[PDB]
A paper describes a structure:
These changes are driven by prestin (SLC26A5), a member of the SLC26 anion transporter family, which converts voltage-dependent conformational transitions into cross-sectional area changes, affecting its footprint in the lipid bilayer. Prestin belongs to the SLC26 family of anion transporters yet is the only member capable of displaying electromotility. Prestin’s voltage-dependent conformational changes are driven by the putative displacement of residue R399 and a set of sparse charged residues within the transmembrane domain, following the binding of a Cl− anion at a conserved binding site formed by the amino termini of the TM3 and TM10 helices. Recent structures determined by cryo-electron microscopy (cryo-EM) have sampled prestin’s conformational space under various anionic environments and located the anion-binding site at the electrostatic gap between the amino termini of TM3 and TM10 helices.
Based on the above studies and the large size of HEPES anions, we assumed minimal binding of HEPES anions to prestin and hence associated HEPES condition to a putative apo state in this study. We associate the HEPES solvent condition to an apo state as the HEPES anion is too big to fit into the chloride site and prestin has a right-shifted NLC, To investigate further whether HEPES anion binds, we determined the structure of prestin in the HEPES-based buffer using cryo-EM. Our initial attempt to solve the structure in the complete absence of Cl− was unsuccessful due to sample aggregation under cryogenic conditions. This density is incompatible with the placing of a HEPES molecule, and we reason it to be a small population of Cl−-bound prestin resulting from a weak Cl− affinity (e.g., EC50 = 6 mM11 implies 17% bound). At physiologically relevant low Cl− concentration (1.5–4 mM), prestin’s binding site is likely to be only partially folded.
Residue numbers in the entry:
A (entry chain A), B (entry chain B): 14 to 577, 619 to 722
Write the structure that this text describes.
């Protein structure tokens, strides 16, 4: 009922003498490998449930509740896949049909191999932009085809060569992703914080907006990429806005307005409506119907999707020769794609709670990309707005994605010619209106401003670095800056001078309470950070500052007054009332409860502190050293003198009692 | 004499109620600026003693003891400056005389502006190699001079253009260093640990060895630089070893042998010899005498220094136009130079102990470089072997460097033509033999292997990165890797399950002592690392593993048995002896004494842990939360329910007593 202890003062020697070490258990790397190579049925089942996750949940799928939600979610996400897929195919400098292949082959496989049950794997704009840049670089727009035969200008051969470049790029991306996954690369997903994921995603949103502005405005500018891409693209659009198409801009604007109104209607009418209406289906149908009936393309020169072929291309081995240079690109796409997909998988897991294993995620994506590259496709990561829509509608399982893949297959097989008249402005408006859920992530700035300025710094710096400095070189910069923020937290700790609560052993801050009173002749210093090379000199200077006791000025003042082995040396100064007034502190207790670790530089600084405080005549005691800290002290030869083991104490109260009893004994 | 406390169980509400907050002191940035703009005589003196350090020590120079040591040290360091200066001028693709200017103008100024009193500022090989590469790139060896007039081949105009390129490079380097120094860039010197500094210095030693191998062997290969420079240079030397000069190799080898024998003699005879003999003076004199008497250059084609001009060139403004491209180089030289000089300044300070302020170091070097760039010089950092020699001989003050500068001035003014016959092999041997003190730093591998494997990792990785990947891109990699080692220490902590020492409040590890016995029904978990985004899921998994209590399997087992707001929910399972045997733990105490900080991800994981443990029916208590940790918990909305403030406890014993009294009360 009451805190009552009556024990002797537990310094380091006393506690070590009262204890006996317990025998260690066997540790053998050979034994670690031993059980691994022994086959057991349970681990065999676990290997399968780890590599083929569909074997786990699909036989246990619940038909009572999940069926309706998955059907609705699949319908909505496929209705979103179609225009997003076509537009993202347009973004990749490839014929629009290959977007449909990109949205069918890798979707079905992720159902077999993937982990997250709320994630939609379709083409993504930034990866599509990278592939389009790769295609442009290898085969430029102004390329002379040796075939001839046909009249002036040709598009089929150039597009075929571009899609072959994409086939090599995505095959290399899939191979790299599979190799990373099998080499246990899923641990790196732990370094993508929520602040670093949300900033990255919002930067990607801005990039997509500025990329599709070109098609929204009907302008025919360049495809500036790399560093400073967003600003270059937006200024190129702004300069060439004089060549805008009034018809295309008008149809795009009315499509965007209808989409925004429908989204607002769905949000307001969430409760009474059993399921959100497929608004994008109405938008696409109305756009293609208006374009076909009014013949906008032949009338006023409106950009159109084109002719979407009707049929499944037979599996085809991709070129591996292009791997010569596409390698530097493939690696970037595989990094960016993995980062984005694991970011949203972690977001969905935090929202709901399930297995989000990144290793099997990378394995599944690597298998999908390669097993798709052989099927006339391109790089496929997780889509962002579509994933948000799928999770919002009520998506429960991955069968929703399979339904979307089935509907896209139906579009490829039967209704591929209905969208041959669909204007590109409709696709641009559909893509832009779906970024709204991603631009809503800008609300984190006030919340993080109120919560923690370091998290706000991470958010702002990843947003800026992934906006103005590309999206592939922005992720690495953001991760490094997050790690340096951790280092900064370790390099600017809270230096607290402690004080003793009366009649108790509670030691808390002296500047933040009135009961807390300092123990006469004793000053306690606390640092809530490890003492290592980065914050060692800072720790020593703060110790000299806060406690008000620095050996340098004390020794100098002894010298000025004179003008007119044992750890410490007693003061030999002749009795004189010329010392500047002070509290004649005899011991300085250092709090090591919060010090996690110490390296060689920290140990050297600690030895220097002890030596220079003992030269003046002031003891230094270490309170609450952890086992690891004592190991670092012993290994770095801090305890060469066995008498330095008496400085350590188990707690602050033990150190204070030791100092008091030492002073009492010294008087006698 | 004995640890005796009798206080009530201090949970968070009780302690907070017993305390009252103390009024904060005024904090105003305006007040910070206020006193800065007010002029006081003491701060005026301090500004001067900070910018002109010579005003501090020079009037207080002690003539009794320092004079002889400084004279000897200055003689030795100047005798080392001469051949090192000439060889490093040879390394920079500039006439050898400019090495003499590089060793006079910036040395005298550092005496006025520098801080460290044991540091020698002369030309350095790697900086000289960078400048020589800059000169080669801007003006190649095969350049057509429009002057004509003279016969085939010309060297004066090409060398003048090269030295003008060096004049722009070093002026930009000095300007950049001064700007960094005045912008308070000396804080970055805290991130250069000893393991990193020593690895960097040994890599520089290997680079210098492989660079001067070319002159030692008499081979006339290329000047490969950049990435993979050491291997390229050494293979180029090895392939062309068939064109070696027997005479030059022989004289270089005998010079090296004489130098090594003299060094061994000096080391063995340290006590009886009043002062080390100037061995390099004998070596240079003998080499030039033999070359002049035997006429090696005209006889057997031995490489020679050349003609060293006799006179001081009048101050001359350097070109600023070359700053167009030399900028990318100048910045690299200023970084590498500052890193090296602050590394050895810190090493000397740790050896002795004095002011090593890096800001004034950068200011002094920036002033020296620019004020020399205007005097026909090049980039000048701290020399390594020469600094070691100066500190070893007994150098006390910077007047030793001034003596070396004076002797170099005498060489320039009077005896500049004595060394016109000195072979380059002698210079190469002299430079190589002085690296011995730097190759002795390889002994850190066993010491760091015994002491700490992470420090050994830092040492090895900085050595490899600064050896095989250049010296300018190696420093940044080493610093980043050191910071990631800190992050790794935070991501692999020691998960310790604690136990109670009998009849006392000491809680220590349960697997490392026999007295330590676990409190029945209570399991204590300790992590000596902050709970943040990097090690949050790892912490939760370790909590489930070590303590043997995971809510997932417990709930699953309740479900299997069934087959046959308040923070926690009591167990409703009907009384059945089908639970797998356990210790029916009722509370799990988490130790937060060693947790420095928590971010949003850590708080979310902690809330999830508390919720999922309360669903089963097991309390979770937090023991020893710091003020900063409680602030992070409160800001991140962990304490939205006021009942969660009762979970916090001041110490482990308080939490154990609270759990015991709660269990006792529950029975009644
Ligand atoms: Cl998107
Ligand atoms: Cl050197």
């Amino acid at each position: 009922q009451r805190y009552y202890v009556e024990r002797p003062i537990f310094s380091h020697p006393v506690l070590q003498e009262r204890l006996h070490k317990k025998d260690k258990i066997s540790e053998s790397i050979g034994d670690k490998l031993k059980q691994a190579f022994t086959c057991t049925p349970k681990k065999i089942r676990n290997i399968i449930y780890m590599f083929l996750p569909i074997t786990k949940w699909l036989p246990a799928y619940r038909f009572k509740e999940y069926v309706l939600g998955d059907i609705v979610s699949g319908i909505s996400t496929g209705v979103l896949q179609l225009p997003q897929g076509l537009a993202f195919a347009m973004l990749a400098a490839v014929p629009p049909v290959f977007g449909l292949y990109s949205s069918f082959y890798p979707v079905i496989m992720y159902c077999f191999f993937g982990t997250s049950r709320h994630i939609s794997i379709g083409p993504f704009a930034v990866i599509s932009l990278m592939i389009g840049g790769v295609a442009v670089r290898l085969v430029p727009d102004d390329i002379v085809i040796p075939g001839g035969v046909n009249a002036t200008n040709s598009t089929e051969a150039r597009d075929a060569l571009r899609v072959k470049v994409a086939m090599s790029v995505t095959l290399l991306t899939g191979i790299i992703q599979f190799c990373l996954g099998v080499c246990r690369f899923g641990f790196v997903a732990i370094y993508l914080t929520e602040p670093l994921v949300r900033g990255f995603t919002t930067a990607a949103a801005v990039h997509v907006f500025t990329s599709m502005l070109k098609y929204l405005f009907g302008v025919k500018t360049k495809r500036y990429s790399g560093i400073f891409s967003v600003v270059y693209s937006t200024v190129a659009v702004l300069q060439n806005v004089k060549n805008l198409n009034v018809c295309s801009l008008g149809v795009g604007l009315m499509v965007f307005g209808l989409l925004l109104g429908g989204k607002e209607f769905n949000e307001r009418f969430k409760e009474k409506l059993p399921a959100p209406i497929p608004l994008e289906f109405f938008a696409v149908v109305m756009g293609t119907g208006i374009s076909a009936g009014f013949s906008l393309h032949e009338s006023y020169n409106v950009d159109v999707v084109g002719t979407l072929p009707l049929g499944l291309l037979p599996p085809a081995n991709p070129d591996t020769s292009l791997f010569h240079l596409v390698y530097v690109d493939a690696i970037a796409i595989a990094i960016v794609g993995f980062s984005v997909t694991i970011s949203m998988a972690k977001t969905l897991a935090n929202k709901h709670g399930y297995q989000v294993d990144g290793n099997q995620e990378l394995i599944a994506l690597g298998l999908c990309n390669s097993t798709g590259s052989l099927f006339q496709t391109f790089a496929i990561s997780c889509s962002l707005s579509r994933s948000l829509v799928q999770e919002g509608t009520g998506g429960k399982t991955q069968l929703a994605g399979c339904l979307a893949s089935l509907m896209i297959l139906l579009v490829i097989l039967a209704t591929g010619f209905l969208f041959e008249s669909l204007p590109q402005a409709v696709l641009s408006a559909i893509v832009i209106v779906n970024l709204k859920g991603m631009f809503m992530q800008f609300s984190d700035l006030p919340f993080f401003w109120r919560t923690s300025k370091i998290e706000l710094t991470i958010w702002l710096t990843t947003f800026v670095s992934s906006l103005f400095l590309g999206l592939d070189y922005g992720l690495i910069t953001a991760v490094i800056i997050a790690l340096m923020t951790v280092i900064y937290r370790t390099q600017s700790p809270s230096y607290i001078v402690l004080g003793q609560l009366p009649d108790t052993d509670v030691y808390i801050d002296i500047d933040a309470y009135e009961e807390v009173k300092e123990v006469p002749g004793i000053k306690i210093f606390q640092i809530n950070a490890p003492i290592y090379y980065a914050n060692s000199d800072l720790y020593s200077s703060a110790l000299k500052r806060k406690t008000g006791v620095n050996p340098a000025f004390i020794l100098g003042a002894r010298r000025k007054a004179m003008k007119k082995i044992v750890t410490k040396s007693t003061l030999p100064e002749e009795l004189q009332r010329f010392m500047p007034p002070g509290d004649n502190v005899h011991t300085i207790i250092l709090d090591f409860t919060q010090v996690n670790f110490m390296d060689s530089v920290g140990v050297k600084t600690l030895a220097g502190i002890v030596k220079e405080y003992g030269d003046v005549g002031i003891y230094v005691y270490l309170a609450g050293c952890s086992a690891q800290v004592v190991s670092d002290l012993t290994q770095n030869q801090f305890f060469e003198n066995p008498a330095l083991l008496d400085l350590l104490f188990h707690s602050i109260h033990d150190a204070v009692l030791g100092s008091q009893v030492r002073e009492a004994l010294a008087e006698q």
